[PDB]
């Protein structure tokens, strides 16, 4: 896991204002989720073939569709696969109106074929600790929701919670994690998005999109689901089901 | 309906900033909604003597704990009924995502007891028509959230949807309605709490409160499930149970 197949190219662009364009294929976690419609409207990361973690307040149900492999949202001919959700587990400590806790696991009906394209990122372990300032990326096609259909990436660095309640007050809980406000937005993930940190070589998942700057302002950080305090969940769910 | 025995007082302060305590007991069927441990999180509004209207995003649950009858949260002495939720009805078209149609209707398990501070307010009727620029009144806990703690009233106009957007783009719904940003901030409504119009010498349900300006700008309207477009549901709802 974590080591893509395409190595993802990031330039200092992605550093400033809304990064940039991604390598085709080179962050082979990243789907789109689209509803009935073929409407995308969230992201989530690939754990392993038959399961993707989103966020919750992206209330998935079954009736939306997992989409692998792409990059342009706009092209009608890369190689992508679309995968029936069979079952949707929503972390029952989501608080809703906190939106603290904002995870969910999707179970894929038939398997996702991995491939260069296509493959897992590596989840932390409960008890790692990437520390504030770290780089990291979040990428997605968030800038769609307005304009590229490209999957944008950005580095930004992480903010430890006391850092981060400087910007958003009793509103950042225990299970959360910021990043940003470094002179970039963090607007390019898609909610329910990655958020990772390259560790021992591989790109680990850290966050999952949580909410934003309503301005998509440089100087205010994104808020993510803090994934170290929320892998046991990912993990006892999948080791029941 | 919506005749408070005891009739608010709004006085021009309430127009401005964050509006002014509201005469006690005047807002009759505001309640407090508080989890399993007494903590006061939402708002909702008794539309009659076993029902409370409240909004989705709320994420309330039968744990919780409906609080009628109340002015101020910090006195320990005033006659207030706590009132186990029996079951909990969120609308089934509830997104969480865009957090359109944000309805949930509450059913007691025990009759609150009507009485001079504890009664229904009207609901509208689907085809009611309350203009852009009739003043409303928002009424709540709201600035507990950081501080006064007895209950707040500010007297807001309403906007229409065309005109809301020019503040919130495409997140403002068809099942929305905002209004304030004429020099008085909204943050007085508590979540899932009431926005009123007086129709017909009877104050109207025409808003529960979804979400607000991230800062309290007295400049940004907020924004309310349009209880006009969720009136049908909420009578179903009644209906069928």
Not at 90 to 116: E, V
Not at 137 to 143: D, F, H, K, M, P
Not at 208 to 237: D, E, F, H, M
Request: net charge positive; proline share 4%.
């Amino acid at each position: 896991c974590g080591v893509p197949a395409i190595q993802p190219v990031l330039s200092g662009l992605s550093r400033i204002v809304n990064g940039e364009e991604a390598v085709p294929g080179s962050w082979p976690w990243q789907v789109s989720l689209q509803d009935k419609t073929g409407f995308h409207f969230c992201g989530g990361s690939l754990i392993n073939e038959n399961w993707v973690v989103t966020a919750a307040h992206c209330g998935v149900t079954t009736s939306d569709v997992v989409v692998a492999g792409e990059f342009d949202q706009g092209s009608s001919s890369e190689k992508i696969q679309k995968l029936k959700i069979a079952k949707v587990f929503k972390n029952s400590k989501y608080n809703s109106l906190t939106i603290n806790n904002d995870i969910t696991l999707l179970k894929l009906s038939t398997a996702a074929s991995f491939s260069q394209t296509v493959s897992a990122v590596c989840l932390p372990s409960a008890s790692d600790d990437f520390a504030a300032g770290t780089t990291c990326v979040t990428t997605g096609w968030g800038l769609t929701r307005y304009t590229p259909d490209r999957l944008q990436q950005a580095s930004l660095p992480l903010l430890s919670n006391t850092n981060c309640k400087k910007y958003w007050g009793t509103k950042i809980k225990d299970a959360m994690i910021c990043a940003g406000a470094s002179g970039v937005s963090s607007c390019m993930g898609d909610s329910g998005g990655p958020l990772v940190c390259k560790k021992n070589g591989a790109w680990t998942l850290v966050g999952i999109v949580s909410w934003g700057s309503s301005t998509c302002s440089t100087s205010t950080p994104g808020v993510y689901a803090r994934v170290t305090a929320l892998v046991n969940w990912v993990q006892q769910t999948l080791a029941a089901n």
